[PDB]
Write a structure and sequence with these properties.
The complex is a heterotetramer of chains A (about 180), B (about 200), C (about 10) and D (about 950).
Chain A (H helix, E strand, L loop, with lengths): L4 E3 L6 E4 L5 E5 L6 E4 L13 E4 L2 E4 L9 E8 L3 E4 L3 E4 L9 E4 L7 E8 L14 E5 L9 E7 L8 E2 L8 E2 L1
Parallel strand pairs in A: 1-9
Antiparallel strand pairs in A: 2-6, 3-4, 3-7, 5-6, 7-8, 7-9, 10-11, 11-13, 12-13, 14-15
Chain B lengths: L1 E4 L3 E2 L4 E5 L8 E7 L5 E8 L4 E4 L7 E6 L2 E6 L6 E8 L16 E3 L4 E5 L10 E2 L5 E10 L5 E4 L13 E2 L5 E9 L2 E7 L4 E7 L2
Parallel strand pairs in B: 2-11
Antiparallel strand pairs in B: 1-3, 3-8, 4-5, 4-9, 5-6, 7-8, 9-10, 9-11, 12-13, 13-16, 14-17, 15-16, 17-18
Chain C lengths: L7 E2 L1
The chains are: A mainly beta (about 180), B mainly beta (about 200), C mainly beta (about 10), D alpha+beta (about 950).
Bound molecules: zinc ion.
PDB class: hydrolase
Keywords: hydrolase, Zinc metalloprotease
Assembly: tetrameric
């Protein structure tokens, strides 16, 4: 019970939403999640004063580059039950540019690959029909160039001859 | 600090976290798993003092949590469920298990986690497939390999290089991922330590 | 009133 | 660092108003030591607390832990003298005592600030190596058998050991704590076992890892450190595992019971007991103090108020009880009245209705916060305690709390833990209740009998039908959660000293209506103030009838203001209202912030009081039994009571008070109140943070309120009469003889009357009492083993003084008379043959004792008030007398003995009071007693006082 993606630049004001008196946690990509707020409003030792709690919500005063992570909630319901949330990931909102499309034919010794090089936001749409055949994967945002990339793999020969729509694409380019 | 162990290879069908710096007899140890490519999810927690065990609505009957006076345990018999298991502890002491209200005191200390995957497959070698651009982007394609991790380095890891995409699970039950690089000869080097395989191929339109 | 707290002396 | 010191807690969080310095330290042998530096104290002190009590005593020898306690004061290795410890402290203005708790054993003492090191060395010899003499054991076993004998017919000890016996025979909680001759001498001899057991017990439990030392003195922290290390780093360590009792004495076969108990006195108390886990480790939140605060609340809409309006109970207590490490008790005791005894089930029903009320509304954070502030304020403005009792309690709680958080251990609360509150409250259910009902109505209807005390009781099991009623109980609308404490002080401003400040309380208002004494505080500088008021009235004590109607008046008044006063009681603003032989006595002590608000409400309800007939009958009944409960008191208290009756001009006995009480009707009391408040005279004492105009305004408020509502008109100067003490003739021996109908022991008081409280006569008596102070305790108790209770000192009454001896034992009073007379001769021989140094020792000792300045405001207020009620107003008494004391010789004391206290003294005013045991007859080496003259028997007190003159009154300054 917690959006899953927020786009806010650095130094901005972040407001993440979510028994009684819920808690808040931070999990950076890779390692263990750390605690930041335990009761409704309480700053754990070592935790920045930028973070604060109120009613079931987490707020950040001046968004720092070190705060770019996925924040979670923790609700300890009665009967010793603990329930987390959907988890909200904090993103950056910088480039706002169009992707670069590259179509790739299957290999020799069947998987068609569609590639998107650099774009923002993350929501690209992208296959004569599409499913149960199209499997995709999105890489994490770049090292402070603030852009994503997408690789769509389509895993017969009875018919030969990848279209992507984007916020920066007034007319979807096809290949 | 918390010292986890036990996670690794498991055929479809125990975890040990040794506590240090405190005693388990006065704290509540929690277990939290996280599916690869998704958020957190609590499974089971135990309070040794009040002697009460709790389980999720998706793992009860199969899993079993325990402890000892200082180390805690988790006995999982029927697996399918593939995630990374962490262990944490309540900040306060002697938290009453039974309750009619909710008092979530934060879990101060955690563990980096132990990975454990469940799959009906054997250790295989990645057979990389080459691509072609025909300004122009080109890359490789790793497919049908087990187990993770793998690293695709271009030109013996001497290129500053373009993006590589995360691993993808197929319906076959075999890992697969792709790595590309945009350029205005290029050779891709894919390594696989657990299967002792190293494949290198050329990429040119 | 809450209680405020036998003793055998010398 | 230092080899003998393991770690040092240099930072002990103290009270901001506390100027004393603290330094905690843990020794190498695991002894937690706290040091207190007070360069302005007149008496240094030290205390050691062993974490081993009478629960760890052997199954064969019960009360061994308490017995060994007494054996330590009887000779050591370095000090082989049997009474070296006792004699040394007496010669240097000091005292000592000890007590053994359940899992505790505390030894404490105070002494002059000069001889602390010498006294601390002698105290340290008790734990290193103690010599248990073969004859000292045979005498001390009688001392232990006698201190238990005096508590046999005591309802407190009877009910305390009964809850132990009714529990689990397996659990150590059922063991005998005190112990008598049977368990110490008889049984070990019947099984061939005792001195060897004392050695084994002192060498297995008296270990350094289970000890805590707290020392207070004028010396600096480093000098105290080097002294404790000198004496206590040599204590043997054995790392003895701390006795823990995770098991609970109560179980399935011990829960849901009815213990109908027959008391000695005519009282009816109901005891509800809830077996709860050990809450000692939850001190930071203290859920037991939380629930105890709500349940035992006396405010409007509480459990007490409901049980009062139904006419069932009078008092309600309250909170949690202490047991041992592993288990505690949550008790709700309540007194059964006329209807309360017939509706016991309904009382407990209401209790669960209040418990269910707490479970319904759940844990409140604002209540806990209120407790946090009340405790934090009480800790900041905390009165400076007397060194002896201070070091004693700290040493006891030194084992539980960290070294740096001891002073703030039981005072400050940190993190709200509702789950812990909910955990304890869950244990408060009918499925986990233990009911113990005590009443005199169960006389001759009991089946079982206690072993050690022989208490008649019957054990029953409450039907499950009653349990269902308590579980399925509808919430009572009367039960409301207490609102915000509107009596919490917010102004702690200390008013600066005025230009007309006085070192002693002065008289600022002398009128026909009231006399006012004012002393603004210039010593302690707290935001508190003590307001004492003495109301004079002839119709208060003129006859036993009015004496009863006066007591019933103030008891009805305190009953009517019980709710309103309790709200200010929690805020540290208390009041006391009792009637004396001269009239009334009001004493409001606490914070002066909202103090005039409390006083105004008291006086206004005092003048215009409407009596409720239901509450009138209840209090009158409880007062009747209370006069019949005096029947079962200890002998020595009866001797002191009878002596007060004899020497006083006018006094009413208990028997003729209840006789007059049977004639006290409701319309008579209603007409008695305005008649009593018709004419008054108020002697007051305002001592605190208030100014002069503030004091005058307070006095003006009291007068104007009494005049408006009660029409109070001033008394006459010749109408203010104080009672006199009967003047005894020369070489006249008088004896009053009655019987203690309950206790099987006999008491006696010997009063040698001296002359009229003059500076000369005062110091001749007190110095003589100082010289014979310790030898009395040593000769009569330690050596001759007469009884446990042996006392000797000055007796001041109505401006008349004298030397009194108080002894309670099982020996004939006439034999005790001889032994005291023989003691007087051998002491006169002692004073006659001692050096000049041996005389200056007792002079300096008494001097320091008299010059021991008060610790807090209430202590200094008590001294001034005593000098006012005595109508002498000698506030500079201590300085003048001590100055005259140091100018005294030995020849003056000899003349004082030969003239007043000799066996053939020309002015011997000797009166005795004999209190026989129950089944003792009436009609009938060492130092031999002299021949005593034939005494006079006193059968009628009226015919006695009429035949003797009366002493004059001491003229004021
Ligand atoms: Zn004793």
């Amino acid at each position: 019970t917690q959006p899953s993606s927020l786009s806010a630049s650095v130094g901005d004001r972040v407001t993440i939403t979510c028994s009684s008196a819920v808690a808040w946690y931070q999990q950076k990509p890779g390692k263990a999640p750390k605690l930041l707020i335990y009761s409704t409003s309480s700053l754990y030792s070592g935790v920045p004063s930028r973070f604060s709690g109120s009613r079931f919500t987490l707020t950040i005063s001046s968004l720092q580059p070190e705060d770019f992570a996925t924040y979670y909630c923790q609700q300890s319901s009665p009967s010793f039950l603990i329930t987390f949330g959907q988890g909200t990931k904090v993103e950056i909102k910088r480039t706002v540019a169009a992707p670069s499309v590259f179509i790739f034919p299957p290999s020799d010794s069947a998987s068609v690959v569609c590639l998107l090089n650099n774009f923002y936001p993350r929501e690209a749409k992208v296959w004569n029909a599409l499913s149960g055949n199209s499997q995709e994967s999105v890489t994490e945002q770049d090292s402070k160039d603030s852009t994503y990339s997408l690789s769509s793999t389509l895993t017969y020969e009875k018919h030969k001859v990848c279209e992507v729509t984007h916020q920066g694409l007034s007319s979807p380019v096809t290949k | 600090q918390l010292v986890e162990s036990g996670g690794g290879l498991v055929q479809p069908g125990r975890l040990s976290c040794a506590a240090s710096g405190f005693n388990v007899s006065s704290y509540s140890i929690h277990w939290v798993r996280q599916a690869p490519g998704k958020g957190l999810e609590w499974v089971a927690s135990i309070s040794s003092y009040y002697g009460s065990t709790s389980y999720a609505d998706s793992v009860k009957g199969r899993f079993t949590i325990s402890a000892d006076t200082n180390t805690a345990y988790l006995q999982m018999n029927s697996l399918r469920d593939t995630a990374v298991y962490y262990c944490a502890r309540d900040r306060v002491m002697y938290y009453w298990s039974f309750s009619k209200y909710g008092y979530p005191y934060g879990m101060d200390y955690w563990g980096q986690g132990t990975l454990v995957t469940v799959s009906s497959a054997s250790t295989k070698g990645p057979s990389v497939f080459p691509l072609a651009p025909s300004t122009a982007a080109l890359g490789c394609l790793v497919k049908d390999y087990f187990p993770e991790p793998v690293t695709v380095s271009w030109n013996s890891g001497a290129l500053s290089g373009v993006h590589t995409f995360p691993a993808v699970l197929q319906s076959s039950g075999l890992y697969s991922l792709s790595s590309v690089v945009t350029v205005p000869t290029y050779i891709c080097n894919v390594n696989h330590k657990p299967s002792n395989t190293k494949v290198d191929k050329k990429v040119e339109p | 009133d809450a209680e405020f707290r036998k003793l055998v002396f010398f | 660092n230092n080899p003998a010191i393991k770690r040092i807690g240099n930072h002990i969080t103290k009270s901001p108003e506390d100027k004393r310095e603290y330094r905690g330290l843990e020794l190498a042998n695991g002894i937690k030591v706290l040091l207190i530096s007070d360069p302005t104290t007149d008496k240094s002190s030290a205390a050691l607390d062993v974490h081993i009590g009478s629960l760890s005593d052997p199954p064969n020898i019960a009360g061994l832990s308490h017995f060994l306690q007494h054996m330590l004061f009887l000779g050591t290795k370095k000090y082989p003298k049997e009474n070296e410890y006792s004699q040394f402290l007496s010669e240097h203005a000091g005292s000592s005592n000890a007590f053994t708790s359940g899992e505790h054993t505390n030894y404490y003492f105070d002494v002059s600030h000069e001889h602390l090191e010498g006294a601390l060395d002698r105290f340290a010899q008790f734990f290193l190596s103690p010599l248990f003499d073969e004859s000292a054991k045979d005498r001390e076993v009688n001392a232990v058998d006698s201190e238990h004998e005096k508590n046999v017919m005591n309802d407190a000890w009877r009910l305390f050991q009964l809850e132990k016996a009714t529990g689990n025979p397996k659990h150590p909680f059922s063991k005998f704590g005190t112990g008598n001759k049977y368990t110490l001498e008889t049984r070990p001899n019947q099984e061939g076992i005792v001195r060897q057991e004392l050695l084994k017990f002192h060498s297995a439990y008296y270990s350094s890892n289970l000890m805590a030392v707290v020392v207070l003195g004028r010396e600096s922290l480093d000098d105290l450190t080097n002294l404790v290390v000198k004496l206590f780093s040599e204590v043997e360590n054995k790392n003895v595992p701390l006795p823990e009792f995770p098991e609970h004495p109560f179980q399935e076969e011990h829960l849901k019971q009815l213990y109908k108990i027959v008391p000695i006195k005519d009282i009816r108390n109901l005891y509800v007991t809830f077996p709860i886990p050990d809450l000692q480790k939850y001190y930071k939140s203290n859920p037991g103090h939380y629930l105890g605060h709500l349940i035992g609340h006396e405010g409007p809409g509480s459990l007490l108020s409901e049980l009062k309006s139904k006419g069932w109970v009078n008092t309600l207590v309250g909170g949690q009880k202490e047991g041992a490490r592993g288990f505690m008790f949550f008790i709700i005791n309540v007194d059964l009245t006329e209807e309360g005894l017939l509706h016991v089930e309904d009382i407990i029903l209401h209790m669960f209705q209040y418990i269910q009320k707490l479970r319904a509304e759940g844990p409140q954070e604002w209540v806990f916060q209120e407790l946090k502030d009340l405790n934090a304020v009480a800790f900041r403005f905390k009165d400076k305690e007397r060194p002896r009792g201070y070091t004693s309690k700290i040493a006891g709680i030194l084992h539980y709390y960290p070294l740096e958080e001891v002073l703030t251990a039981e005072y400050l609360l940190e993190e709200f833990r509702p789950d812990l509150i909910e955990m304890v409250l869950d244990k408060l259910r009918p499925e986990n209740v233990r009911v113990a009902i005590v009443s005199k109505s169960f006389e001759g209807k009991t089946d079982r009998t206690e072993e050690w005390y022989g208490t008649q009781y019957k054990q029953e099991a409450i039907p499950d039908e009653v349990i269902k009623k308590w579980q399925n109980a509808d919430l009572n609308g009367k039960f409301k959660l207490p609102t915000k404490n509107e009596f919490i002080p917010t102004n702690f401003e200390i008013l600066p000293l005025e230009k007309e400040a006085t070192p002693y309380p002065a008289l600022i208002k002398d009128t026909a209506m009231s006399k006012l004494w004012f002393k603004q505080d210039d010593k302690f500088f707290l935001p508190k103030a003590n307001l004492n008021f003495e109301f004079f009235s002839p119709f208060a004590y003129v006859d036993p009838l009015h004496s009863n109607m006066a007591y019933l008046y103030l008891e009805l008044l305190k009953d009517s203001l019980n709710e309103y006063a309790y709200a200010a009681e929690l805020a540290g603003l208390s009041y006391d209202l009792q009637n004396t032989i001269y009239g009334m006595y009001l004493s409001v002590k606490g914070y002066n912030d909202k103090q005039p608000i409390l006083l105004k409400k008291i006086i206004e309800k005092m003048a215009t009081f409407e009596i409720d007939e239901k509450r009138f009958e209840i209090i009158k009944e409880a007062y009747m039994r209370s006069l019949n409960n005096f029947r079962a008191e200890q002998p020595h208290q009866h001797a002191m009571y009878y002596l007060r009756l004899l020497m006083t001009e006018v006094a009413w006995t208990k028997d003729e008070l209840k006789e007059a009480l049977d004639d006290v009707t409701l319309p008579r009391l209603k007409a008695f109140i305005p008649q009593l408040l018709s004419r008054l005279h108020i002697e007051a004492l305002l001592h605190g943070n208030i100014t002069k105009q503030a004091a005058l305004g307070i006095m003006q408020m009291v007068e104007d309120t009494l005049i408006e509502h009660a029409h109070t008109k001033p008394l006459l100067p010749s109408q203010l009469v104080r009672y006199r003490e009967v003047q005894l003739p020369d070489r006249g021996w008088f004896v009053y003889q009655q019987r203690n109908e309950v206790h099987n022991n006999s008491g006696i008081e010997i009063y040698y009357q001296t002359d009229m409280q003059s500076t000369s006569e005062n110091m001749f008596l007190e110095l003589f009492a100082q010289i014979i102070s310790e030898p009395a305790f040593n000769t009569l108790r330690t050596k001759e083993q007469l009884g446990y209770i042996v006392f000797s000192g000055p007796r001041r009454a109505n401006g008349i003084q004298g030397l009194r001896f108080i002894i309670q034992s099982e020996k004939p009073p006439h034999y005790l008379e001889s032994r005291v007379e023989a003691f007087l001769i051998t002491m006169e021989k002692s004073i006659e043959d001692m050096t000049e140094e041996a005389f200056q020792k007792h002079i300096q000792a008494l001097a320091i004792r008299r010059l021991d300045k008060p610790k807090k405001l209430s202590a200094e207020s008590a001294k001034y008030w005593g000098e006012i009620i005595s109508q002498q107003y000698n506030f500079d008494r201590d300085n003048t007398e001590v100055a005259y004391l140091k100018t005294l010789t030995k020849e003056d004391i000899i003349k004082f003995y030969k003239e007043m206290l000799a066996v053939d003294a020309p002015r011997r005013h000797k009166v005795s009071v004999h209190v026989l045991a129950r089944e003792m007859d009436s009609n009938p080496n060492l130092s031999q007693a002299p021949a005593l003259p034939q005494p006079e028997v006193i059968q009628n007190m009226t015919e006695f006082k009429r035949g003797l003159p009366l002493f004059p009154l001491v003229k004021p300054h």
